[PDB]
Symmetry: C2
Subunit: 178 residues, 2 copies
């Protein structure tokens, strides 16, 4: 039933939920050509969420897309989306301090950039926690680009279900609860 | 299309590459085995640097496309995506600030100076990182086989042009 992803435009504006093979559940939105929003539902930093993260986004080859970014925490990320196979592979390179004090980062990051930057200078950076994992995509929605509703509140337990069940977004892909 | 079609992980492993990033940086790189890479930098910011037995995660994303992730003694993180059937790659290198500030420190046979890399990454600034996400053209491929210790050393392999 799903459209074939063939171009950059096909990919930009798409809203994903996926589960890594380590059990971590992420939600991620290609908000525009150089911007990503995301929200973390399961894993070491579940509850953490992020908007307006600058990123490099490329189509590597027809229907396969690579996203690269570095965070206020000092974390590096390389994601490879294969939407036509409902698969992804992500490598996250966490500073030592995120592994040892993950709770610091479990917040709306945008409200606490200074805390992220003070923590990354106060605590240990090495050795890195490197997490390279395949994931299965469990949801894709066409949000359009620059849709500020997609990722605009903290995650709650039922949210992935509500989104997948069509209970979260209205006909214009805006929040029913807002 | 003289080149064999890459379809499995075994097809990729043992392959010796040379590639040039769009910015002009030139790398020579070898998939020595399922978890280990050797490489030598020929041009750019850190030309002259080389590395053996860098532990890495190596996976096939999908038929004929291969992703390699590793982290370095310098603190640098790397994610490479090889598309040998298109003679193309895309690399993202995330350098700590200090490598951009003092690239000459890293220009050596890294294996003999692990201590220096680790001490440097604590001594100098990490942020802001220099992130280099770029496509590269693959200009050479050779089948060296796995665990071939002659591919990357001080001397040239030159079982090739």
């Amino acid at each position: 039933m799903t459209k074939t992803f063939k171009t950059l435009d096909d990919f930009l504006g798409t809203h994903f939920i996926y589960t890594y093979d380590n059990g971590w559940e992420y939600e991620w939105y290609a908000k525009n050509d150089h911007t990503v929003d995301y929200r973390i539902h399961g894993g070491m930093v579940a509850g953490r969420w992020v908007t307006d993260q600058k990123a490099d986004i490329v189509m590597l080859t027809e229907g396969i897309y690579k996203i690269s970014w570095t965070e206020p925490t000092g974390t590096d990320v390389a994601l490879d989306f294969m939407p036509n196979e409902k698969k992804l592979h992500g490598t996250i390179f966490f500073p030592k301090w995120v592994e040892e004090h993950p709770e610091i980062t479990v917040t709306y990051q945008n409200e606490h950039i200074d805390l992220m930057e003070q923590s990354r200078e106060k605590y240990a950076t090495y050795p890195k926690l490197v997490v390279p994992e395949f994931a299965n995509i469990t949801y894709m929605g066409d949000a359009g680009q620059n849709n500020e509703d997609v990722i605009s509140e903290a995650p709650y337990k039922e949210m992935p279900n509500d989104i997948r069940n069509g209970k979260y977004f209205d006909q214009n892909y805006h929040r029913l609860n807002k």
